[PDB]
């Protein structure tokens, strides 16, 4: 009685565009073109698709299928599958927090740019500002100029000394205090996600209509814009030039696997939650297939969108676009690309729609990111929760604000890297691995094929079967081992991170993982009988 069954989506297209919205983000824009043009160029398409087909798609569709079939949260679904792995649902909840600490600060940067783009003359064009040094050298200025090791561009100066104010910190050691502007920006962000998540899937499914469609429009405008630019063929050349020898490197495949995984992000419970609020009769196979093909093709065209403008930028300078594309990260979009669109007619337009496009990319992904955790806790603590949703949503959101307060600092950018590389990545792969292994081996892939057979009416192919049994956990296992084996020395803005950073990172990497073996210990410690009896009843799901 009472509430009972959960709510459903208002329309198919709403959740289709919703999962597409989650799938597509910043990384799709700048990450893939960089890792692509760096690793054998266009040839990078060959393993990337493979790592998709054999790796990404099966995890994606498995996650989605479990989601639509069981209609449970990230924590409650393990109660009815493998109780011992219930801690998985908790782990993600911590992970997301770590993700939500830096992810929205980037959008806060893009927002500071967005509000700083309303002026007729854009700030990062001139050097006559309050933050520029004597090194600031800009164009429409005396020619014959010769760049110096210490010299700095007005865009690099703007991004460095103003929106980041990273010069006010010596590193991870001393990074305080806080830039209140980015605090107001990220506050506005937490507000615009607050009013887009608090009611649930009904509102999110409608905000996504804008947040998931506009980026393609902006990419089209910057696409036709970058295409009409002189000497733009250099960036495309450097972008799709086949270097098959690079395919001999055992690394590239890893980059491709990691890329497709972390741009599809399966087994994170968000797709699970988005699938939870859907029709049982409704198909999800076609959904997953197409949806993925979107995050991917979208990445492919995004490559052109970036490297056309990078090509023109390499044309106004002196070629080897790689040089203008050395640094990968926020500097590629916030400095190089911004300085690039600055030297174009009606630059205010392309700037506004550009940074607006960035925010628009981060927004939906963030929506879904929180949405998964919220759904998980609500389904895990029903009645105990739902008195109001805006209460718990407010709690987790302001919690994310306090979590981002460490990131809103001067050296905050540093932390952004430290959290993006060290903390999140290995663990999610880990929890995705444990999840896949638990669904394919513990729950039995046979009964899973029976569930799909009851879902769509037919048992899933032997391809998906062998992918779930072997190929996908090997896919995650590959990236896990390759990651652990070679933790990365990481650097940002002429500043090498301290040797101990990784230690710190590992802390942030393990502080989320500690919950599942201790939950296994809690279960096996609480469950009476013998190890085989309690572990046999702990391997066997809920009877009711």
């Amino acid at each position: 009685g009472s509430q009972g069954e959960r709510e459903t989506w208002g329309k198919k297209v709403d959740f289709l565009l919703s999962v597409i919205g989650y799938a597509v983000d910043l990384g799709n824009v700048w990450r893939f073109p960089y890792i692509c043009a760096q690793n054998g160029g266009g040839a990078f398409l060959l393993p990337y698709t493979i790592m998709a087909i054999f790796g990404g798609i099966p995890l994606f569709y498995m996650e989605l299928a479990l989601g639509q079939y069981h209609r449970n949260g990230c924590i409650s679904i393990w109660r009815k599958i493998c109780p011992i792995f219930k801690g998985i649902g908790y782990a993600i909840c911590i992970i997301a927090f770590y993700i939500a600490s830096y992810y929205n600060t980037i959008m806060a940067w893009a927002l500071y740019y967005l509000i700083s783009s309303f002026t007729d003359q854009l700030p990062w064009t001139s050097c006559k500002n309050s933050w520029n040094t004597g090194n600031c050298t800009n164009y429409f200025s005396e020619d014959n100029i010769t760049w110096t090791l210490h010299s700095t561009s007005p865009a690099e100066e703007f991004y460095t000394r103003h929106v980041l104010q990273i010069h006010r910190s010596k590193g991870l050691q001393d990074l305080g205090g806080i830039s209140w502007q980015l605090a107001l920006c990220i506050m506005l962000i937490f507000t615009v996600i607050y009013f887009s998540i608090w009611k649930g899937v009904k509102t999110s499914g409608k905000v996504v209509w804008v947040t998931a469609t506009f980026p393609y429009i902006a990419l089209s405008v910057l696409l036709v814009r970058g295409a009409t630019l002189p000497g733009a063929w250099r960036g495309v050349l450097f972008y799709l030039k086949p270097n098959w020898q690079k395919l001999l490197e055992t690394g590239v495949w890893i980059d491709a696997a990691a890329q497709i995984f972390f741009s599809l992000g399966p087994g994170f419970g968000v797709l699970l939650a988005f699938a939870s609020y859907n029709k049982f009769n409704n198909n999800c196979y076609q959904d997953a297939l197409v949806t993925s093909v979107v995050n991917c093709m979208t990445s492919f065209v995004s490559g052109f969108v970036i490297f056309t403008v990078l090509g023109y930028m390499a044309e106004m300078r002196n070629e080897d676009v790689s040089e203008v594309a050395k640094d990968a990260g926020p500097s590629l979009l916030f400095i190089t690309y911004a300085e690039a669109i600055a030297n174009m007619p009606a630059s205010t337009f392309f700037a506004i729609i550009f940074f607006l496009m960035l925010i628009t990319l981060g927004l939906d992904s963030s929506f879904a990111g929180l949405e998964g955790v919220i759904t998980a806790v609500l389904d895990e603590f029903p009645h105990v929760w739902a008195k109001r949703r805006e209460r718990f949503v407010l709690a987790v959101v302001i919690t994310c604000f306090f979590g981002s307060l460490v990131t809103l600092t001067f050296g905050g950018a540093y932390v952004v890297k430290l959290l993006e590389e060290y903390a999140t990545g290995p663990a999610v792969l880990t929890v995705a691995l444990i999840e896949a292994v638990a669904v394919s081996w513990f729950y039995g892939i046979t009964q899973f094929c029976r569930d799909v057979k009851e879902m769509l009416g037919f048992s899933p192919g032997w391809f998906w079967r062998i992918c779930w049994v072997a190929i996908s956990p090997l896919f995650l296992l590959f990236i896990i081992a390759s990651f652990l084996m070679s933790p990365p020395q990481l650097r940002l803005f002429q500043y090498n991170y301290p040797y101990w950073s990784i230690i710190l990172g590992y802390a942030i990497g393990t502080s989320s993982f500690i919950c599942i073996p201790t939950y296994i210990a809690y279960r096996l410690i609480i469950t009476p009988g013998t190890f085989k009896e309690r572990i046999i009843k702990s391997i066997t799901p809920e009877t009711p």
Epitope: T146, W147, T148, L149, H150, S151, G231, R234, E315, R317, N318, E319, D320, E323, Q494
Partner: antibody, heavy 119, light 108 residues
Framework: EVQLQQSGPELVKPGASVKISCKAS????????MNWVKQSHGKSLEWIGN????????SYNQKFKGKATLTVDKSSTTAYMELRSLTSEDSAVYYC????????????WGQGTTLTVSS | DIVMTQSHKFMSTSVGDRVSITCKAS??????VAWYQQKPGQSPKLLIY???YRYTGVPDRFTGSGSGTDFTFTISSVQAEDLAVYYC?????????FGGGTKLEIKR
């Protein structure tokens, strides 16, 4: 004005090592990349690699990777190049030349260093 | 990598005549070519940078042209002291490579 005074000629036996200095003067030493160019007898110029005086930012050539080692000293504003596993091909004239970051031309060169690898 | 090719190893000219040295690159270079003048027994001296621009201390009789792959170094009034070996060099892609070198022999 701007002068790059290198070290004198060196006669060294094969299999050994050899180090060449480069006292830079007449400009801000930390404001420019320091490069090294190899020139064989009757052959063309050959770029070995550069170095950033600030942090010792060495950028070598794939043809010279593990063949040459560039170092730098700010306390005396002097760049060094060390060569190991010396052969008859290394018997060439070497220059240390200043260069900006962009555009990457070699404005000022050293007087040169004659290296002879023979027993 | 990039191959800077000077097809003519030797070029004959006279004092006062108009001489022009060619330079062929592997791919498109836009306008990123520098011309150097190395007199016998001296270090290479920078004359031209960025295809057409002259460096400071370089006489007006030295000019540069070309945009793309083929580039040209021009001297209108050849002097007796202009006897040297001229090199062309690209400055965009790592590593920086040089031309084979065109020795300018004077005819009298």
């Amino acid at each position: 004005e701007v002068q790059l005074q290198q070290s004198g000629p060196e006669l060294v036996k094969p299999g050994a090592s050899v180090k060449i200095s480069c006292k830079a003067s007449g400009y801000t030493f930390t404001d420019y990349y320091m490069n090294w160019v190899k020139q064989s007898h009757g052959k063309s110029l050959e770029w070995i690699g550069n170095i950033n005086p600030n942090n010792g930012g060495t950028s070598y050539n794939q043809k010279f990777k593990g063949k040459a080692t560039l170092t730098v000293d700010k306390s005396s504003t002097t760049a060094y190049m060390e060569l190991r596993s010396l052969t008859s091909e290394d018997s060439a004239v070497y220059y240390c030349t200043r260069s900006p970051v962009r555009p990457y031309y070699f404005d000022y060169w050293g007087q040169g260093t004659t290296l002879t690898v023979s027993s | 990598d990039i191959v800077m090719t000077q097809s003519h190893k030797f070029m004959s000219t006279s004092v006062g005549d108009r001489v022009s040295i060619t330079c062929k690159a592997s791919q498109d270079v836009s306008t990123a070519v520098a011309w150097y003048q190395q007199k016998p027994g001296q270090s290479p001296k920078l004359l031209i940078y960025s295809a057409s621009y002259r460096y400071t201390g370089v006489p007006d009789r030295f000019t540069g042209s070309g945009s793309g792959t083929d580039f040209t170094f021009t001297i209108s009034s050849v002097q007796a002291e202009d006897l040297a070996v001229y090199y062309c060099q690209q400055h965009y892609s790592i590593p920086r490579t040089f031309g084979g070198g065109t020795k300018l022999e004077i005819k009298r």
